[PDB]
């Protein structure tokens, strides 16, 4: 029945069967998601296909390249602690911040799982006057050499022409030695479980601002459930404390998305990423 | 029936073992052990201590028991006693053979048998009467008038003996009472008073000897009891 | 078995089945009531047919009538507390008393039940010289009128002639609006559950003493068991304490029965009926 | 055999699970759980770490 | 299983069935006594047939007879406490002693049981020059007479000739009124359960030393198991404490066996048999 001496609802039992209803009758209503929503949601494997903006490269110069790791995009970005100092009264106020970053639909799902398997999709938005954008992957480490080449002759090349297609869409395959790879940082050094890959986005002519939006490729799959990640309230984006030189938003963020307003928060003074050892 | 839904206590209907009279009804556990694979020695090996027969408590009551063993001379005349009166069954069941057996029984309903022997060498004469007055404690008004004279005893249930003819005489007294049985724990309501008169005196000097036996037949023993009363 | 954890002999189970015998055998002896008693008793429905004397009317004058309620006869009479004062030493002695009343066979059974249904039988014994006795029932209340008539023209009349039949036997039917009626006093006044009836016993010539004996009519039936009534020991009738002017019987009673001796107890001084609130 | 009439204690013959060498015999309750509907990957997917043979202690 | 709430191994159950193995498998190895020992042992009924020496008659003179009870041989001999006094320093030392006696194979088995049934076998060894040995049994008590005869005319006689057969072997039957008899001492005197028999061993010419060895006759049988007897350690035979005049052996014993060395222990001063009441 609903109560007893044996465990009435353990994990292994909850996955398969529900306890008796309080009504002692059928408690279930029929699925009508397709009848109101107009669409049906059942699996996060499909929802990760949705592409949202993930990072932005601003603080370099007028370069013709931007190299960065791919697995770092499956992670949710690091949350930072921002020190603000009042230009007048000189007391410190403290908030949170995403340094030129933000999570994706993909990152909400990937942070519940341990390993991944499949290709990552990267779409780029550039500034005006850019004619081309080129994408190439390279192994980040010529194993056994202290240095990696600056060119390659057999790597993939993919050219998109901005003034006729404004978003440069690329798909980066899954190239790793193992069945399913790892995407979070570790100190393992004996041999590796991640497929360590670079991705070089070029612009002709060279430009400064690169806006990246990431999403799941068709073959995207995560493996082992581990649990819900550390989160921050979305309402904390609009809460602010006012000081002399401007506003201090609890959740400070940059123009990572080339289509979002720039929030009117003053720049911080120091940034510190929350470490796993900082949790109390 | 008031309906009862029990699931925490077993209806331990075993652990309930009656042994003849006593009923044990037990909780927890009942244990029993001893030397296993028990056999018995055949009857030739023992059985030099028993007879080829069994004795219940009903016999031991069907056994004749000597009550009197005495005589009476020529000095006692007609209408006078030659033997002491016997209360049935008080003066019978008070002997140890019966009393030890009737103990542990509530009551007794049975017919009693009074047998009397008579010794005569063929030169002796006389007749003697043996009667029984029913329920002497319930009609004490009438006892001594129905037993002080021959011809008021013999119209009652009686048995005569010609001294020179009968060497044994036995009167069968069936149980009779306002009740069902004879209370043993209180010895209440004896169902007859055996009295012995002289129908005719002796004609010689030589007295006559007699033995009085008493037993029961048609025996219905009552309920088992402790049988003790306050005093 | 004889013992256990469940209730071994509840009420609902006692009505139907007996527990195991101490002998663990058949404990029952055969019915031989007809063989010793010469008669069989099984139901109180038959025993109430027995008529015994119930009340007596003495303290009125030489009247030609005596009106009184019928349901009051199914009740057992009220027990009263009698105050006796010693004509010499002037200290009080206290006993019990039935004021010109006594219970019946009927009253022993009726006091175990809540409702009744059926007719009551009333038999009268009068003094010498009475020629006739007449019986009539009337409703006691002309509903909606402050007064009831003193005559009736369609009521039942029943005449018995004493010097040729010395006991005037009458049978009063069951006339009440409800299936089974009530016979005890209550304060209900909205509408009524008792059939309130008078019964007028006349004598020609008018006389003083009327002795009434009551019994159950054939159709007598009681309904709901409620329990044993408050009782008084019958042996208390003969126990007495002596004082100067006479005897004080613990249970004092009048010549209710025209065939019983008058007990030699002195009259009391005050009478008080035991109320339900007097019980301690 | 000494005969024993027990009605208050269950002959809990289960809750007795030998695992190769060790025998557990338990009272109250034995519980066991994990991820349900277990499958295994086919041998092509792994088995690059083993030979097509088993080695006993003999 | 191996454990539980009911008694897991009572006596009555141990006689018939063993508990489950710790291996939860077959724990039994096959009998191979016949394959290593060359013989099989299963019953003490056969082992008692082995004849060992039991008593010795030394402390009489040059006699032509030696009468003694037979049932006393089925008992194990009495153990005695020996007082030793140091001829020099005059302090007491204390040990144990078998006075011209010792137990037999038979006595190891007979002391576990209560009653016996069957014949006893007695074999005699004498000194040199003895020509004959004769054996006769007699009832020890002419019942109802204060004295027993010194001869008999219908008793059994059995003659062995030493210089042609050095060991005089006799077999004494079971002559007792009861099925199985008793062989230990008791105070019962009303009527008797033991078959009280004497046995007279003669020598022609008369001699002093008689060495007796006892064993079980074919029909030997013991009845009721009672338990293990009071024992003494066999190693205590060689342990000794030294004093001035010699050695004091913890277990002192005489030349009961005409083929054993005489141990070099000094004679005691007083002897006291351990009574049943001496046990603490």
Please report, for residues A193, B104, D46, the alpha-carbon distance to residue A115 in angstroms, rounded to integers and kept in the order given.
10, 91, 17
Residues of C with Cβ-Cβ distance to B4 under 8 angstroms: 6-7
Domains in chain B, CATH or no CATH each = 1-231 (2.60.120.20)
Instruction: Say yes or no: D16 contacts chain E, CB-CB below 8 A.
Output: yes
Answer yes or no: do B36 and E15 touch at CB < 8 A.
yes
Contact partners for chain A, using 3 or more CB pairs closer than 8 A, are: D
Q: Determine the length of chain E.
A: 280
**Torsion (CA) C184, C186, C191, C195 in degrees, nearest 10:** 20
Q: Determine the length of chain D.
A: 58
φ and ψ of A191, to 5 deg: -140, 165
Contact partners for chain E, using 3 or more CB pairs closer than 8 A, are: B, D
Q: Which two tokens stand for residue D10?
A: 């269950």
Going by C-alpha positions, the residue among A211, A198, A236, A278 that lies closest to residue A95 is A236
**Mutate which of E5, E12, E179, E223 to test chain B, going by most B C-beta atoms within 10 A?**
E12
Please report, for residues B206, C96, C170, C251, C265, the alpha-carbon distance to residue C240 in angstroms, rounded to integers and kept in the order given.
72, 11, 38, 8, 9
- Give the C-alpha separation, C47 to C77, whole Å: 19
Q: Which two tokens stand for residue B167?
A: 């060497």
Q: Which residue of chain D has the CA closest to B15? A: D5
Residue B219 CB neighbour total at 10 angstroms: 19
Radius of gyration of the CA atoms of chain B, in A: 26
Q: What is the DSSP string of chain D?
A: --EEEE-SS----SSEEEETTEEEE-SS------SSS-----TTTS-SSS-SS-----
Q: What is the DSSP string of chain B?
A: -------SS----SSEEEETTEEEE-SSEEEE--SSS-----TTTS-SSS-SS---SSTTTSS-EEEEEEEE-SSS-TTSEEEEEEEETHHHHTSHHHHHHHTTBSEEEEEEEEEEEE---TT---EEEEEEES-TTT-TTTHHHHHSSTTTSTTSEEEEEETTT-SEEEEEE----SSSSEETTTTB---EEEEEEEEE--SSSS-EEEEEEEEEEEEEE--B-------
Q: Measured between CB atoms, which of B1, B9, B11 is closest to C12? A: B1
CA distance E269 to chain D (A): 54
Which residues 6+ apart lie within 8 Å of E59 measured at CB? E100
* Contact present, E229 and E216 (Cβ < 8 Å): no
Query: What's the N-to-C CA distance of chain B in angstroms?
Result: 45
Q: What is the DSSP string of chain E?
A: ----SS-SS-HHHHTT-PPPPTTSS--PPPP-HHHHTSS----HHHHTT--EEEEEE-SS-SBS--EEESGGGTSPPPPEEEEEE-TTT--EEEEEEETTB---HHHHHHTTBSEEES-EEEEEEE-TT--EEEEEEE-S--TT-SS--S--SSS--EEEEGGGSSSEEEEE----SSSSEE-S-----SS-SS---EEEEEEES-BS-EEEEEEE-TT-EE--B--------GGGGT-EEEETTEEEESEEE-S-STTSPPP-B---SEEEEPPGGG--
CA distance D35 to chain E (A): 31
CA distance D30 to chain B (A): 21
Answer yes or no: do B2 and C17 touch at CB < 8 A.
no
Residues of C with Cβ-Cβ distance to B30 under 8 angstroms: none
Tokens 């009550």 sit on residue: B67
Which residue(s) pair with E134 in the sheet?
Answer: E159, E202
Q: Which two tokens stand for residue C217?
A: 């009519």
Residues of E with Cβ-Cβ distance to B34 under 8 angstroms: 12
Radius of gyration of the CA atoms of chain A, in A: 23
Query: Which helix (H) or strand (E) segment is C53 a member of?
Result: strand C52-57
Q: Would you give the DSSP letter of residue C179?
A: S
Going by C-alpha positions, the residue among E121, E102, E117, E101 that lies closest to residue E215 is E121
Instruction: Say yes or no: D29 contacts chain A, CB-CB below 8 A.
Output: yes
Please report, for residues A66, A68, A69, A136, the alpha-carbon distance to residue A139 in angstroms, rounded to integers and kept in the order given.
15, 11, 10, 10
Answer yes or no: do C1 and B6 touch at CB < 8 A.
no
Residues of E with Cβ-Cβ distance to D13 under 8 angstroms: 1
Cα angle at C156 between C152 and C159, to 5 degrees? Answer: 110
Instruction: Say yes or no: D28 contacts chain E, CB-CB below 8 A.
Output: no
SS3 A26: coil
CA distance B162 to chain C (A): 44
Going by C-alpha positions, the residue among A104, A120, A132 that lies closest to residue A69 is A120
CA distance B11 to chain D (A): 9
- Give the C-alpha separation, A132 to B19, whole Å: 108
Q: Which two tokens stand for residue C68?
A: 């009184």
* Contact present, A97 and A271 (Cβ < 8 Å): yes
Answer yes or no: do D36 and A16 touch at CB < 8 A.
yes
Answer yes or no: do A10 and D45 touch at CB < 8 A.
no
Answer yes or no: do D31 and A15 touch at CB < 8 A.
no
Q: What is the DSSP string of C188-218?
A: --SS-SS---EEEEEEES-BS-EEEEEEE-T
Q: Would you give the DSSP letter of residue C74?
A: T
* Contact present, A56 and A100 (Cβ < 8 Å): yes
SS3 C240: strand
B10 burial via Cβ count (<10 Å: 0-12, 13-18, 19+)? middle
Structural domain spans, chain C: 1-280
Cα angle at B9 between B8 and B13, to 5 degrees? Answer: 155
Residues of D with Cβ-Cβ distance to E5 under 8 angstroms: 6, 8-9
Instruction: Say yes or no: B1 contacts chain C, CB-CB below 8 A.
Output: yes
Give the burial string for B127-162 (b: 16+ CB within 10 Å, else e).
bbbbbbbbbbeeeeeebeebbeebeebbeebbbebe
- Give the C-alpha separation, E9 to A39, whole Å: 70
- Give the C-alpha separation, C136 to C66, whole Å: 11
**How do strand A92-98 and strand A80-85 relate by DSSP bridges?**
antiparallel
Q: Which two tokens stand for residue B83?
A: 């033997």
Please report, for residues D25, E125, E166, E254, the alpha-carbon distance to residue E258 in angstroms, rounded to integers and kept in the order given.
61, 8, 13, 10
B200 burial via Cβ count (<10 Å: 0-12, 13-18, 19+)? middle
- Give the C-alpha separation, C77 to C253, whole Å: 12
Query: Which helix (H) or strand (E) segment is C85 a member of?
Result: strand C80-85
Question: Is the preceding omega at residue B89 within 30 degrees of 0, hence cis?
Answer: yes
Structure solved via: X-ray
What is the number of alpha carbons within 13 Å of residue E258 lying toward its C-beta? Answer: 16
Answer yes or no: do B27 and D8 touch at CB < 8 A.
yes
Query: What's the N-to-C CA distance of chain A in angstroms?
Result: 41
Q: What own/partner pairs with CB < 8 Å and gap ≥ 24 does E9-15 have?
A: E10/B31, E10/B33, E10/D2, E11/B33, E11/D2, E12/B33, E12/B34, E12/B35, E12/B36, E12/D1, E12/D2, E13/D1, E13/D2, E15/B36
Going by C-alpha positions, the residue among A115, A106, A96, A113 that lies closest to residue A55 is A106
Residue D49 CB neighbour total at 10 angstroms: 5
Cα C72 to its chain centre, rounded Å, is 8
Contact partners for chain C, using 3 or more CB pairs closer than 8 A, are: B
Q: Which two tokens stand for residue E239?
A: 């342990």
Cα angle at C55 between C49 and C57, to 5 degrees? Answer: 140
Three-state SS for C98-132 is ECCECCCHHHHHHCCECEEECCEEEEEEECCCCCE
Residues of B with Cβ-Cβ distance to E178 under 8 angstroms: none
Please report, for residues C85, C88, C97, C180, C273, the alpha-carbon distance to residue C266 in angstroms, rounded to integers and kept in the order given.
10, 14, 12, 43, 19
Cα C113 to its chain centre, rounded Å, is 13
SS3 C257: coil
CA distance C221 to chain B (A): 26
Residue C235 CB neighbour total at 10 angstroms: 9
Q: Which two tokens stand for residue A174?
A: 């899954």
Which residues 6+ apart lie within 8 Å of A272 measured at CB? A80, A81, A83
**Torsion (CA) C54, C59, C64, C69 in degrees, nearest 10:** -40
- Give the C-alpha separation, A68 to A201, whole Å: 9
Q: What own/partner pairs with CB < 8 Å and gap ≥ 24 does D24-33 have?
A: D25/E1, D25/E2, D25/E3, D29/A6, D31/A7, D31/A10, D33/A10, D33/A11, D33/A12
- Give the C-alpha separation, A159 to A169, whole Å: 9
Q: Which residue of chain E has the CA closest to B32? A: E12
- Give the C-alpha separation, D2 to E9, whole Å: 9
- Give the C-alpha separation, C228 to C226, whole Å: 7
φ and ψ of C167, to 5 deg: -110, 120
Please report, for residues A108, A252, B179, D47, the alpha-carbon distance to residue D42 in angstroms, rounded to integers and kept in the order given.
31, 49, 97, 9
Going by C-alpha positions, the residue among C257, C258, C273, C242 that lies closest to residue C88 is C242
Answer yes or no: do D1 and E5 touch at CB < 8 A.
no
Q: Measured between CB atoms, which of D29, D36, D45 is closest to A12? A: D36
A238 burial via Cβ count (<10 Å: 0-12, 13-18, 19+)? exposed
Residues of D with Cβ-Cβ distance to B9 under 8 angstroms: none
Q: Which two tokens stand for residue A68?
A: 């960065």
Answer yes or no: do E1 and D16 touch at CB < 8 A.
yes
Query: Which helix (H) or strand (E) segment is A274 a member of?
Result: none
Query: Which helix (H) or strand (E) segment is A46 a member of?
Result: helix A44-47
Q: What is the DSSP string of B113-127?
A: EEEEEE---TT---E
Answer yes or no: do E6 and D16 touch at CB < 8 A.
no
* Contact present, B206 and B60 (Cβ < 8 Å): no
Answer yes or no: do B36 and E12 touch at CB < 8 A.
yes
* Contact present, C126 and C208 (Cβ < 8 Å): no
Asked if E touches A (at least 3 Cβ pairs < 8 angstroms), the answer reads no
Answer yes or no: do D2 and B33 touch at CB < 8 A.
yes
* Contact present, B123 and B179 (Cβ < 8 Å): no
Q: Which residues of E touch D (CB under 8 A)?
A: 1-7, 10-13, 16-17, 22, 24
Give the burial string for C78-102 (b: 16+ CB within 10 Å, else e).
ebbebebbeeeeeeeeebbbbbebb
CA distance B45 to chain E (A): 8
Largest CA distance in chain B: 92
Going by C-alpha positions, the residue among C169, C158, C161 that lies closest to residue C135 is C158
Asked if B touches E (at least 3 Cβ pairs < 8 angstroms), the answer reads yes
Tokens 């302090």 sit on residue: E91
Four-residue CA torsion sign, A20, A21, A23, A25? negative
Answer yes or no: do B15 and D5 touch at CB < 8 A.
yes
Q: Measured between CB atoms, which of B10, B31, B32 is closest to D7? A: B10
Tokens 């009508």 sit on residue: A32
* Contact present, E171 and E114 (Cβ < 8 Å): no
Q: Measured between CB atoms, which of C4, C7, C24 is closest to B2? A: C7
SS3 A220: coil
Based on DSSP, count helices (H) and strands (E) in chain A, helices before strands: 4, 17
Q: Measured between CB atoms, which of D34, D45, D46 is closest to A12? A: D34
Q: Which residue of chain E has the CA closest to D16? A: E1
Cα E197 to its chain centre, rounded Å, is 17
Answer yes or no: do E179 and B33 touch at CB < 8 A.
no
List the E158-161 sheet strands across, edge first: E67-69, E198-204, E132-138, E158-161
Q: Would you give the DSSP letter of residue A19?
A: P
C237 burial via Cβ count (<10 Å: 0-12, 13-18, 19+)? middle
Q: Which two tokens stand for residue E269?
A: 């001063």
CA distance D31 to chain B (A): 23
What is the number of alpha carbons within 13 Å of residue E81 lying toward its C-beta? Answer: 9
């Amino acid at each position: 029945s609903n109560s007893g001496t044996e465990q009435q609802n353990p994990r292994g039992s909850s996955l398969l069967t529900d306890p008796e209803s309080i009504t002692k009758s059928d408690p279930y209503n029929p699925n009508i998601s397709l009848l109101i929503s107009g669409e049906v949601f059942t699996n996060f494997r499909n929802l990760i296909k949705r592409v949202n903006f993930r990072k932005a490269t601003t603080l370099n110069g007028k370069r013709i390249s931007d190299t960065f790791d791919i697995n770092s995009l499956i992670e949710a970005p690091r949350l930072d602690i921002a020190q603000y100092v009042d230009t007048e009264t000189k007391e410190a106020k403290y908030g949170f911040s995403y340094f030129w970053s933000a999570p994706t639909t993909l990152n909400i799902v990937a942070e519940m799982y341990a390993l991944y398997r499949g290709g990552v999709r990267v779409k780029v938005v550039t500034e005006k006057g850019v004619d081309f954008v080129r994408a190439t992957v390279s192994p980040q480490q010529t194993y056994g050499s202290d240095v990696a080449p600056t060119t390659h002759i057999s790597t993939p090349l993919a050219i998109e022409q901005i003034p006729i297609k404004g978003v440069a869409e690329f798909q980066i395959p899954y190239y790793a030695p193992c069945l399913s790879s790892s995407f979070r940082a570790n100190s393992e050094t004996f041999y590796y479980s991640s497929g360590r890959n670079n991705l070089d986005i070029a612009t002709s002519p060279p430009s400064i601002n690169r806006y990246y939006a990431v999403g799941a490729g068709d073959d995207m799959d995560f493996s082992i459930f581990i649990g819900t990640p550390p989160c921050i309230h979305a309402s904390q984006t609009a809460q602010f404390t006012k000081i002399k030189q401007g506003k201090v938003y609890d959740l400070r963020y940059d123009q990572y998305d080339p289509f979002r307003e720039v929030q009117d928060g003053t720049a911080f003074l120091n940034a510190r990423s929350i470490e796993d050892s900082d949790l109390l | 029936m008031a309906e009862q839904i029990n699931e925490n206590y077993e209806n331990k209907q075993q652990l309930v073992e009656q042994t003849e009279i006593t009923t044990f009804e037990n909780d927890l556990i009942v244990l029993e052990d001893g030397p296993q694979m028990e056999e018995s020695l055949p009857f030739a090996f023992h059985g030099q201590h028993t007879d080829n027969r069994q004795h219940t408590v009903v016999n031991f009551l069907q056994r004749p028991q000597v009550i009197f063993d005495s005589s009476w001379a020529s000095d006692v005349p007609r209408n006078k006693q030659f033997m002491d009166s016997i209360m049935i069954p008080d003066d019978i069941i008070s002997f140890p053979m019966f009393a030890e057996k009737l103990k542990g029984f509530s009551s007794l309903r049975a017919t009693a048998v009074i047998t009397v022997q008579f010794q005569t060498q063929p030169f002796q004469a006389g007749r003697v009467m043996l009667g029984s007055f029913p329920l002497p404690t319930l009609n004490p008004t009438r006892v001594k008038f129905a037993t002080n004279h021959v011809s008021r005893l013999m119209l009652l249930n009686h048995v005569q003996c010609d001294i020179a003819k009968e060497t044994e005489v036995s009167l069968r007294i069936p149980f009779v009472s306002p009740y069902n049985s004879y209370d043993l724990v209180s010895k209440r309501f004896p169902w007859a008073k055996v009295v012995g008169l002289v129908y005719s005196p002796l004609t010689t000097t030589i007295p006559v000897d007699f033995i009085v036996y008493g037993h029961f037949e048609d025996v219905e023993l009552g309920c088992p009891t402790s049988g003790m009363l306050a005093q």
